[PDB]
Design a protein around this ligand. Structure first.
Ligand SMILES: O=S(=O)(NCc1ccco1)c1ccccc1F
Lengths: 300, 237
């Protein structure tokens, strides 16, 4: 079990750690988050009481170092930082716990939600999407745009998801125009799985990370990217059996976890109705289909 | 974006462009089988690809053999149309390739777009106009060459005959659409109107009669009357 300390909480903020969120008052004695489960990535994120625009946050894995939070009054945001002095960091954490200034990562033992949302998400892959290589942790916010979004402006601040475009030379073999446009299995299995992602786990990790940034920051290009990768599987007639079974599980917990009031912007009607009802895989997502119908029958 | 009544005059600037119409690519008679089921029998079809500025028409004849052993023919016809258009473009010299291709039916955008991925600077456009190019087969000279074909075959025509010697492309295209709309709405009456006078012949290298300027006015008047009559019949107005 690991800890992320906070130097102070100088401004009123809502703090989220994974799918949990606490309200913190201006200069309330908040000194951090404890009992964070080892073995998964995590995300700590912020929404200031005063500017409900720009949700921002940090992805991190506590196995990769000791991390803490500290408000910066010049840039006006809670910053993540790494403490390289191991003894200095344990000492801080121990004193804060003793004073009981820390909330506890509030996991229920029965609960596999977080695992199920982050199964394939790996901190090294995240750091290739969010390229900031002096830090072991990764900042994202509402407003960051994707590489693909920029093609249609600041590169250092972009989210470098793998570009997917159904109407490109990349996706469309010359001479198989009709075939590959209607049956993307070539594009999926040879181009993306074998060529770029290397395996389905990395593909699945990108998909899960896209979804989580759309959900936690309202990052629209992350939402576009999540839908794109679902659409690419769903529109392929030939998909490994193991991947289809895993996708149903992935999407199931993604749909389960979405806040009810956000289904309008975060879920793309066209993609889902096609995936669940028109696509080659219409019959391969039994749990995803059952939860979508009982929870969002309106979209469909 | 989409072509409509406002930007109509762009058909006739000096940016090369092509209308593609796919309505008569995949053609079938429907009949009964010995067992009382319905079956289709295909006939030769065509792609109607027209330069509205020069009258140059590229009539790609689609021979029935192309459908042999294929399923989902109506969908494939669209892809076949885009393959044949795209090959027309490759076949032309650079300074002749179109800058724009406007499809008459929106279901052709994705097929053409995919086939044209090699020509990213050629714009594929839909149109809001309800152009009457499907009546291109009422045209005996074209009907005849389509039906007679024994293999795939491109045939080149000027759909405006020699009209541009005397009138602008704007006016020629308006005459062309008025003739085709009339053919579409009432073929019988329309072809009655053009040959009513056996003394007005069709040159061997022409699909319209050699009307004088004055007889074109009378002709166009008669075609407008016909269309308007048919319309009242249709709606009871
Ligand atoms: O191929 S046609 O244009 N089709 C019918 C039509 C209607 C009015 C004139 O022609 C044609 C018909 C009859 C005599 C010569 C022709 F060129």
């Amino acid at each position: 079990m690991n800890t992320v300390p906070f130097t102070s909480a100088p401004i009123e903020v809502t703090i989220g750690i994974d799918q949990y969120s606490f309200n913190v008052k201006e200069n309330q004695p908040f000194h951090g988050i404890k009992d964070i489960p080892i073995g998964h990535v995590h995300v700590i994120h912020f929404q200031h009481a005063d500017n409900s625009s720009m949700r921002y946050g940090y992805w991190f894995d506590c196995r990769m170092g000791n991390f803490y939070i500290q408000y910066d009054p010049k840039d006006g945001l809670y910053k993540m930082m790494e403490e390289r002095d191991g003894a200095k960091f344990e000492n801080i954490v121990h004193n804060f716990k003793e004073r009981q200034m820390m909330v506890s990562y509030p996991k229920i033992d029965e609960d596999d939600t977080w695992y199920n949302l982050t199964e394939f998400v790996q901190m090294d892959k995240i750091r290739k999407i969010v390229r900031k290589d002096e830090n072991q942790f990764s900042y994202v916010d509402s407003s960051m745009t994707t590489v693909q979004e920029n093609e249609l402006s600041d590169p250092a601040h972009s989210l470098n998801y793998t570009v997917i475009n159904f109407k490109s030379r990349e996706a469309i073999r010359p001479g198989h125009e009709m075939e590959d446009f209607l049956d993307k299995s070539y594009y999926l299995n040879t181009v993306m799985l074998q060529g770029i992602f290397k395996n389905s786990s990395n593909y699945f990790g990108e998909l899960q990370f896209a979804f989580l940034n759309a959900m936690f920051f309202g990052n629209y290009g992350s939402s576009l990217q999540w839908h794109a990768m679902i659409e690419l599987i769903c529109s392929s007639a030939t998909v490994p059996k193991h991947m289809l079974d895993k996708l149903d599980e992935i999407l199931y917990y993604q749909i389960k976890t979405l806040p009810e009031q956000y289904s309008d912007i975060l879920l793309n009607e066209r993609v889902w109705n096609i995936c669940l009802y028109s696509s080659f895989q219409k019959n391969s997502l039994h749990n995803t289909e059952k939860i979508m119908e009982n929870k969002y029958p309106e979209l469909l | 974006g989409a072509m409509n009544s406002s930007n109509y005059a762009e058909l006739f600037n000096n940016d090369i462009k092509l209308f593609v119409d796919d309505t008569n690519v995949y053609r079938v008679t429907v009949h009964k089988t010995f067992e009382g089921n319905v079956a289709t029998k295909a006939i030769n079809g065509c792609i109607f690809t027209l330069n509205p500025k020069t009258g140059h028409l590229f009539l790609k004849i689609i021979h029935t053999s192309v459908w042999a052993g294929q399923k989902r023919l109506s969908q494939l016809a669209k892809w076949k149309t885009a393959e044949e258009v795209s090959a027309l473009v490759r076949s032309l010299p650079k300074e002749e390739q179109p800058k724009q291709i406007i499809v008459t039916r929106k279901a052709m955008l994705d097929p053409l777009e995919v086939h044209m991925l090699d020509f990213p600077n050629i714009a594929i456009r839909p149109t809001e106009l309800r152009l009457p190019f499907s009546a291109a087969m009422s045209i005996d000279k074209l009907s005849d060459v389509v039906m007679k074909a024994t293999e795939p075959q491109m045939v080149l025509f000027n759909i405006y005959d020699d009209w541009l010697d005397r009138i602008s492309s704007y006016t020629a295209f308006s005459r062309l659409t008025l003739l085709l709309r009339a053919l579409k709405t009432n073929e019988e009456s329309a072809k009655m109107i053009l040959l009513s006078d056996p003394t007005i012949t069709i040159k061997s290298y022409h699909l319209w009669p050699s009307f004088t300027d004055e007889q074109w006015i009378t002709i166009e008047s008669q075609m407008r009357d016909l269309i308007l009559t048919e319309y009242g019949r249709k709606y009871n107005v």
